[PDB]
Amino acid sequence: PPYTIVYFPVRGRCEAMRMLLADQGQSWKEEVVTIQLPKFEDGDLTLYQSNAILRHLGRSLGLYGKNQREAAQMDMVNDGVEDLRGKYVTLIYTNYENGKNDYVKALPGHLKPFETLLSQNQGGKAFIVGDQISFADYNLLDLLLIHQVLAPGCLDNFPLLSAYVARLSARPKIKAFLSSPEHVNRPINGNGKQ
Template sequence: MPPYTIVYFPSRGRCEVIRMLLADQGQSWKEEVVTLDAWGQDTLKASCLFGQLPKFQDGDLTLYQSNAILRHLGRSFGLYGKDQREAALVDMVNDGLEDLIRHRGQLFLRNYEEAKAQCLKELPGHLKPFETVLAQNKGGQSFIVGDQISFADYRLLDFLLNHELLFPGYLNDYPLLSAYVERLRARPKLKAFLDSPEHVNRPISSRLKI
């Protein structure tokens, strides 16, 4: 039996980055899919520590909160920078993405088309900090921090790929980020996951149907 179990909705949401990381690290995991109807019955919600999913099992360790899960896996697989300086930068990138993801979530709870238009308008300003950090590391020709992949790379890749679904071709305007995405996508195990039907057919959000 795989040592890891992901309990989540039938969507990418907060868990696709975790799946990317595990796949790229050659790990297997079990999925327990929770439908919105089942979640609405409140029994499972009441059993979750913060009343939220994802829930993540690593052997006898149960974790909630997606960022805590990412940091745990980052430490487990050496994906947290090579020293304290790099770890701080990894945290900075991840926290910056967290702010954007929360902002996007609030937007899309309103009118979908209006939210999409605003998202596109804001995109250059929102991507600029990540372009800056990337450019500062070997001229943008490596990972977001240091010379080895970190959990922040998976988080940024997930963010950029989700926007490719919303705005096909938008990365053409961001050559540094576009090349970065292609480098990560070329990693064999990650490529196999990203090309899999499980990933391709999984919506970004089960609630918003995108």
């Protein structure tokens, strides 16, 4: 510490890290830019790449599992989350009008794997991997929230993902963040589409 996030006036690739810091009871400075990013500072350490930052917070704050297997599975989940996020960004910023239809029908095929993982872990009553929350949970949660906005009801056929979202969102510190002015008045994406 101290922590500082330098990024555009959007939720984009930073909401996950913001919810993580909030939930872990940490404070941070927010530096807004208009026109890579985000840049993150942790005392003397400067970082780039939202996932490099998430893993760094996972390591230092104890949100990276308890062993090799969990660490490996968490990486797997995050990589998957990032693959869908990359597709999403492409839609939003380059083929929203035409591509939206195709994306939404294909969407359920991408969520299924996460539903499967949840069922395999304590009947989807705990976290994505293990018995404790990890950096991966915050990233997945964010991915699900913006998708519900992109296509309402996309989680209808997924009772575990659906429950998981309500469960995590109810966590007091996260609930406060999601209700915060900073969060509420910030668009999901930089182009007004979502």
